[PDB]
Structure 1
Amino acid sequence: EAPNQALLRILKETEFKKIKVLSSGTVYKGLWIPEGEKVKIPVAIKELEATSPKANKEILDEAYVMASVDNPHVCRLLGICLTSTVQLIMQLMPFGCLLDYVREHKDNIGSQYLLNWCVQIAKGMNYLEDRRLVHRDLAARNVLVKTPQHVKITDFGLAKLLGAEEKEYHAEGGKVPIKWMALESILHRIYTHQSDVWSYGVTVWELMTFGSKPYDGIPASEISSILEKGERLPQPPICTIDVYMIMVKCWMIDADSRPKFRELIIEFSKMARDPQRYLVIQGDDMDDVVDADEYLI
């Protein structure tokens, strides 16, 4: 119901430079140098290839959602460039997605890091709930790493802002990641902040298992059935009953019985105060470079 006065910055092609590829849709690492600004901002540039009115339609919708959010735990969209193919310019997250990061650094990841990430993600998600936004694609692959102590939620490709009175969202078609979906979503294509909570649970499970694939080797087709019998992801070896209990609660069939993001922040913060009691792990020129987080135009 309130007016979205967010600003959409249009960037000049000549203002930034692509330094190297980060993926191939294609994403580049590069630098944005606002003319006459005297700063160099590290960025990720997502361009996309053979122009399709359908594909341009999608990225503009993602740009719209990203331009409308502003929280320390949500990815910052710097602007867009209107070249043949529209490119999204974001803040560079040096360490990549969190799923790959826990896989690559298992042996160096302590309980303090795991719990802090859980807290940060819950803060980002609580913020989106406040903005009446439903992510619909929360997963460890969609959380990025600015620094090991600072992650942010990303990928607003499925995100849906809700209407003033719209309590839930009814999708129609389209492939949504099945292993991260609430049961009400799979069966009735219904999405809510509470279904994001369910995905929060899987995401935490992915982290606690250091990057394991949920329901590994189980046809997505069967998933709906497995969850109906009452089966759920198993307790990660490093998890105390306290942590697993939280995950399980995010997987309750009754959406309203699952925890609220604001509560997940409180619980995980408490545990983050004494990490070892909750997770048991063995061994526990760039002169003018300025991070986008410090560049407020």
Structure 2
Amino acid sequence: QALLRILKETEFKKIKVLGSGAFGTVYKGLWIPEGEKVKIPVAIKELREATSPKANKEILDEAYVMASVDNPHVCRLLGICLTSTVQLITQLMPFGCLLDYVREHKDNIGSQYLLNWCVQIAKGMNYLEDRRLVHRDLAARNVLVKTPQHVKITDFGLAKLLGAEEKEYHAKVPIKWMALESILHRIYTHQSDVWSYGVTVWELMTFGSKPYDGIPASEISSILEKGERLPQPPICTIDVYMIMRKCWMIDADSRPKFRELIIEFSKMARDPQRYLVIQGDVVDADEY
């Protein structure tokens, strides 16, 4: 497939810095297709130079698979701009990430919503799993809100790009969302994505709580083998907490499977009150 526009530096424009990341910067910008009067709002993620342990040929390869994900719950790479720095063009999400969303609404968010988002993130992930792909960096900060009732998983592929996989590579890494095998041996698989998924749900049930507050990154491995795990969210019924605890098992193949999770959460979403107890010119990526 193609579906990956290759843009020239004069076909996009960086307007405002959305926010800065660990290895780059994101931007509120405009896509301006050469040879036509159209301006499309987009998000431009620019990776810092020499930040990726890969040459351009390899980079562009991965961008094709990135630009080839077709699922309502996974964002699609729209275009790329390879030079002395790689820039990623994706659709602009006006309502930001889901983490900041559950934080701003520490409460006025009902159960139905929470279990809903869990089903969706489980759908995007399963999709990837079927296509035999590993996200390697799933977190509530990496889930964007298209509309309150439809969230998409963003940043597919980025980690593999920044060289997560590369064995000998010695570059930050999201330790607090990583499975023991990822932290210990840098092994990434679908069952290691499940751990991150379990951490993600946790972030959502706590309305944006930081995992292992205070606990240094370096201690996380030791605390995990000692048997420690993120605590049961207050609004969570033991039935819900266990599923998360099952995503945090040492044995990778023991952990649930996104397919099972979709059914397990789809079930609870039919009677949420029982499983969660809460008190209460400028076109568009779409029109193109």
1:179 is displaced (CA, Å) by 1.2
Cα separation, partners in 2 of 1:281 and 1:181, compared to 1, 3 Å: same
Match of 1:40 in 2: 39
Aligned residues: 284
Match of 1:13 in 2: 9
Task: Check whether the contact 1:65–1:159 (CA below 8 A) recurs between aligned residues.
Answer: no
Report Cα offsets for 1:123-157 as digits up to 9, x if no partner: 11101111211111111111111122121112235
Cα separation, partners in 2 of 1:111 and 1:191, compared to 1, 3 Å: same
Separation of aligned partners in 2, 1:237 and 1:260: 25
Which segment is superposed worse, 41-50 or 109-118?
41-50
Query: Secondary structure at the residue paired with 2:15?
Result: strand
Separation of aligned partners in 1, 2:162 and 2:90: 24
Query: Secondary structure at the residue paired with 2:220?
Result: helix
Which segment is superposed worse, 39-48 or 256-265?
39-48
1:92 is displaced (CA, Å) by 0.6
Report Cα offsets for 1:258-295 as digits up to 9, x if no partner: 11001111111111122222111112xxxx75543453
Cα separation, partners in 2 of 1:188 and 1:290, compared to 1, 3 Å: same
1:65 is displaced (CA, Å) by 4.2
Which segment is superposed worse, 138-147 or 84-93?
84-93
Which segment is superposed worse, 127-136 or 154-163?
154-163
Task: Check whether the contact 2:53–2:169 (CA below 8 A) recurs between aligned residues.
Answer: no
Cα separation, partners in 2 of 1:168 and 1:84, compared to 1, 3 Å: closer
1:204 is displaced (CA, Å) by 0.3
1:218 is displaced (CA, Å) by 0.9
Task: Check whether the contact 1:134–1:162 (CA below 8 A) recurs between aligned residues.
Answer: no
Task: Check whether the contact 1:59–1:157 (CA below 8 A) recurs between aligned residues.
Answer: no
**What residue ranges of structure 1 are gaps of 5+ in the alignment?**
none
Task: Check whether the contact 2:4–2:77 (CA below 8 A) recurs between aligned residues.
Answer: no
Separation of aligned partners in 2, 1:207 and 1:164: 25
1:238 is displaced (CA, Å) by 0.4
Cα separation, partners in 2 of 1:292 and 1:193, compared to 1, 3 Å: same
Normalising by structure 2, report the TM-score: 0.84
Cα separation, partners in 2 of 1:7 and 1:105, compared to 1, 3 Å: same
Which segment is superposed worse, 144-153 or 194-203?
144-153
Separation of aligned partners in 2, 1:239 and 1:66: 35
Report Cα offsets for 1:150-208 as digits up to 9, x if no partner: 2111223554599999999999xxx4211111122222222210011011001100110
Which segment is superposed worse, 41-50 or 154-163?
154-163
Task: Check whether the contact 1:238–1:279 (CA below 8 A) recurs between aligned residues.
Answer: yes
1:214 is displaced (CA, Å) by 0.9
Task: Check whether the contact 2:198–2:247 (CA below 8 A) recurs between aligned residues.
Answer: yes
Separation of aligned partners in 2, 1:168 and 1:138: 23
Query: Secondary structure at the residue paired with 1:159?
Result: helix
Root-mean-square deviation (CA, aligned residues, Å) is 4.0
Cα separation, partners in 2 of 1:65 and 1:117, compared to 1, 3 Å: same
Cα separation, partners in 2 of 1:204 and 1:55, compared to 1, 3 Å: farther
Task: Check whether the contact 1:56–1:85 (CA below 8 A) recurs between aligned residues.
Answer: no
Separation of aligned partners in 2, 1:200 and 1:158: 17
Normalising by structure 1, report the TM-score: 0.82
**What residue ranges of structure 2 are gaps of 5+ in the alignment?**
none
Task: Check whether the contact 1:134–1:159 (CA below 8 A) recurs between aligned residues.
Answer: no
Cα separation, partners in 2 of 1:89 and 1:167, compared to 1, 3 Å: closer
